[PDB]
Design a protein around this ligand. Sequence first.
Ligand SMILES: CCCCCCCC/C=C/CCCCCCCC(=O)OC[C@H](O)CO
Ligand code: NA
Length: 385
Amino acid sequence: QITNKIHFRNLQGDLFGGVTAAVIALPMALAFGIASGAGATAGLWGAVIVGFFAALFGGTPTLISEPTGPMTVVQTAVIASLVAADPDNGLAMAFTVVMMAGLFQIAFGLLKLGKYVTMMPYTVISGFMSGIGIILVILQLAPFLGQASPKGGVIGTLQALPNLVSNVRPVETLLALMTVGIIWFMPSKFAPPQLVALVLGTIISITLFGDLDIRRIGEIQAGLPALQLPVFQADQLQRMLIDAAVLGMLGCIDALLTSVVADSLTRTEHNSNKELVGQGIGNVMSGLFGGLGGAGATMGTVVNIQSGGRTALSGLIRAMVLLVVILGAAKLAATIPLAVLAGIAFKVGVDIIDWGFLKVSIKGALIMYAVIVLTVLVDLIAAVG
Ligand SMILES: CCCCCCCC/C=C/CCCCCCCC(=O)OC[C@H](O)CO
Ligand code: NA
């Protein structure tokens, strides 16, 4: 009808699905937020808002949308660059970009476009993806070392590598490695590794408690409030639209590619242009409330489905579990150390870089490598300096 496929069977499936997808979203929404440079709060609220509305208004019932880790990476550059231009409205501006990219998605969908962003070749997707993975890893380079990220970032960071060398925090590195370890080697499929890693890492600051280490600090309790546009007449503004153009585009490609995975596991098919409209709305709303930009998650989505999610009620439920978790359990986050999140973010990076493809045309091999290099260069560029 006017919304995504919602019906009142799969109450059990949709409930187990939403709640599994909420606990998965939680460690990486914290991670992506911090990494973003916007609050940890910006990460969560995107996860709720993009999640909810895209679930309410899209065309893929099983689909779990959220700040996705090529959304985070792109968005993180944008924010950096817009703060460097205007430290008083940079963030705000960036949220306005999230909104604008929302709008773009709405249009690409409203305009018989969703169809042919499927025409992307694997080699390109794979280059982009391994490209984004590398960046994410290097961002965590600095959190791993136990000092905060420099302003490059990653040019700032690589610039700052030298005596970032010996200002080290050994316990933090130890903490970060420990986290990676927890995720990497637990055979012994619920108790998802990331939530396990997250929880143990915190509490293992009953071993390393006497030491000082960085944690997510306290943070805005409870409800979020409307930040309408600063579009700002900027010398920025021309830069904002190119930014909204990429972000919107990227968010469709990521939302869609997954929606194909959603198709696979379910024997169902889905509606692209409606999905893009769902993504648009979810993003517009997220920006309107300081959330990050999102798209369809594919870690979030498969786990929802295996739990047995079958209806957009999965999504709705997910976003509301999250919602109460944020507004009631805000105090817990504050003790979660940054190293643990770095570790988590690190492996997400590691996990999205494509390496089988490493170790079949001589063309593709090359295209990929270039797309990789191209994708780190533009990233490095987009951050002012
Ligand atoms: C020539 C012009 C330069 C081109 C440069 C830009 C390339 C285009 C961006 C592609 C977006 C691909 C997004 C793919 C995200 C889907 C990821 C996915 O479906 O699976 C994730 C999994 O975790 C991973 O192993
Ligand atoms: Na995805």
